[PDB]
Amino acid sequence: GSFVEMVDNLRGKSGQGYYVEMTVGSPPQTLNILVDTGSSNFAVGAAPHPFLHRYYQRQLSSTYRDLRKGVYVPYTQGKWEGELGTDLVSIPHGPNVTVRANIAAITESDKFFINGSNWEGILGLAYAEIARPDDSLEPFFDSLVKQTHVPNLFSLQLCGLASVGGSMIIGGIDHSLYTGSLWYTPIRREWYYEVIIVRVEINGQDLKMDCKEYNYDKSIVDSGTTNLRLPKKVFEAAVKSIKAASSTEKFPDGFWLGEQLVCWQAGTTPWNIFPVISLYLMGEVTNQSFRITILPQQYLRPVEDVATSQDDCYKFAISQSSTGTVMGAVIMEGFYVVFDRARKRIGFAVSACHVHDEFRTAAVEGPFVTLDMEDCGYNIPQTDESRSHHHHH
């Protein structure tokens, strides 16, 4: 209700996401939960694991109700699986309400929990369509809004191992967390937080692709993804351009693949040879867009290893995708991002936790007017499995 209580309620480690405290059950069990706008389950570690000291103990919650239904959730990189139920859930540093939500108690997992990350569970903030095992499992935020008078919106300020902070404001927008204008791009379809990129520039220069290539096969806003991820053709045009701009430096191929650090003497990194990247997002008005401009300090991420303490070393945090553009924590860290589910749009403003550069600034600017936007959306080939399923909503 007053966002002073919700400011600074996220923590994390670099490249391991941002988590918020939540309490589950009665009496309350406090757990650190990853904020993930890329998925739609609330799932908590619920059995011992080498990388957890803490986990949800269903047997200690007088309010736990078992749903007697399993759930299995494969990723390209690993998996989690568990038993569905419901429990009382509150956010200690969030709105002053308690709700009964679905919770998947993770009983087995592979490559999901990481050594040292400090979270024990994930909060999928995206829409029911992508929930597992299907869209009848109501996601947490849908329950929150239905059961309380919490407005149907939340906003994220992600402030860039190494430790990180920021804010998730639930039910509102806190004006102390951004400067300048807030620009909105429509949510194209409520499954992921899917948006439409209409133009891409690297140091002022247009990539000049068919704009559907930018959104092939979707573009999404995803706090659960580290990198900016780009479709193959786009990723290759982008690497070409950033290489061109930085050609005073001849890096190994591993670097461009994210597989190798590149270093300079401490304090000497030539930031000026690395270009800014502007993504122009479809505006709320037909024929308008606005751009979000990313500094090299967002996509070249420092990594401290043992054998080069007097060097600053960096990993390239743009990577190739085969499942569309993903605007991950790398993009989000520049910005205050408003998930306005009520008005089916996403807002971007320059964050009050700025990443600065010597001479340039991360920016949100518009309008830019065209001959449409454009149509730059891609229509994913409709499978027979998708076609057949009935959605009685």
Ligand SMILES: CC1(C)Cc2cc(Cl)ccc2C(N[C@@H](Cc2cscc2-c2cn[nH]c2)C(=O)O)=N1
């Ligand atoms: C949302 C989440 C946790 C989903 C996920 C499931 C699995 Cl099994 C592995 C990695 C990830 C994963 N990967 C991120 C990296 C990341 C951001 S927060 C925690 C992670 C992570 C990396 N490995 N396991 C979690 C990515 O690919 O960019 N993100």
Ligand SMILES: [Zn+2]
């Ligand atoms: Zn607390």
Ligand SMILES: [Zn+2]
């Ligand atoms: Zn039917």
Ligand SMILES: [Zn+2]
């Ligand atoms: Zn359905």
